[PDB]
């Protein structure tokens, strides 16, 4: 229990539980995010659910009728190594000249496989809250709001 | 932001196909 | 203010909220389906003993907040007194408590990033060999 | 981080009475 070092300013999951360390760690980080999001999800307004019901229609379409793709563009990522900066400044880029619906429902598919290939969960969060305000321009939320 | 590019191109790709076949 | 419905202002908060609890939740979801037999049983290994010490000392984790709560701190703020604290402190008991309170924490924490800081930079500190003994003896 | 110092004292003493109770 010496000093610990600040945090800074292979996506196979076995290859982070080799030692029973890694196995408690995992159960305990776990449990505290379980926890949070059954507590968040408990609280969330009845209008915020029906917004998460549609992304959930939609964007799991997205997953399987894609899934190809969404491979696909995940290798084309890892090609060479990126930042969260970088991919959030592409999708900034497109749906700048882009206004369709499909766009936005992709991004959030392929964002939403980064997290899940991505083993560091500090990142990850970084890049779900930064790319969700992206995503969720005016065009979008017009969208969303229309459907409901 | 060549690979990046790619991507980019990609996710609107796959974005005009499905403003073609949900809506 | 940590109570969520303050934050959900606008439409577009509410949306916002929506895509981030998909990609989190997604996520959390695909990350317990790869998890082996052994991580799993660790997990509902965690979730009795503190689930009982969450109830057992309800009184004394809000005691706890309140007394936190006080004035603002850090991540490293919490995560190094729980080090100083476990460093002479042997027992199972301290470190069960402790994965009650910071998950308590993080429930009242309104900020995603900072409160996965939190949940990785402690779980580091509680997961020390002691406890690691603790957990796989008990199995 | 006077507060910081009751909440850590507080854990141990709510770890040493699970110690107790348990065993
Ligand atoms: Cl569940
Ligand atoms: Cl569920």
Same mark, same amino acid.
Not at chain 1, 8 to 14: D, G, Q
């Given at each position: ?8 300013? &292979? =996506? #196979?999951? @076995?290859?982070?539980? $080799? ?13 505290? &995010?379980?926890?949070? @999001?059954?507590? @968040?999800?408990?609280? @969330?307004? =009845?209008? =915020?659910?029906?917004?998460? *019901?549609?992304? #959930? ?23 060479? &190594? ?5 991919? #959030? ?8 000249? #882009? ?12 964002? =939403? ?18 790319? $969700?305000?992206?995503?969720? *321009? ?7 709001? *229309?459907? &409901? | ?23």
């Amino acid at each position: 229990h010496n000093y610990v070092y600040p945090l800074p300013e &292979s =996506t #196979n999951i @076995l290859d982070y539980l $080799s030692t029973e360390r890694d196995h408690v760690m995992m159960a305990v980080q776990y449990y505290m &995010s379980k926890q949070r @999001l059954d507590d @968040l999800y408990r609280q @969330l307004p =009845t209008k =915020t659910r029906s917004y998460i *019901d549609i992304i #959930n229609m939609y964007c799991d379409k997205v997953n399987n009728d894609y899934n190809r793709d969404m491979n696909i563009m995940y290798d084309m990522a890892s090609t060479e &190594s990126f930042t969260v900066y970088d991919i #959030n400044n592409e999708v900034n880029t497109i749906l700048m000249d #882009n206004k369709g619906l499909g766009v936005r429902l992709a991004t959030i598919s392929f964002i =939403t496989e980064l997290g899940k290939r991505c083993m560091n969960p500090v990142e990850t969060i970084k890049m779900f809250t930064l790319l $969700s305000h992206t995503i969720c *321009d005016d065009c979008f939320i017009d969208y969303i709001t *229309d459907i &409901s | 932001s060549s690979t990046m590019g790619q991507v980019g191109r990609q996710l609107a790709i796959i974005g005009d196909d499905i403003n073609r076949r949900y809506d």
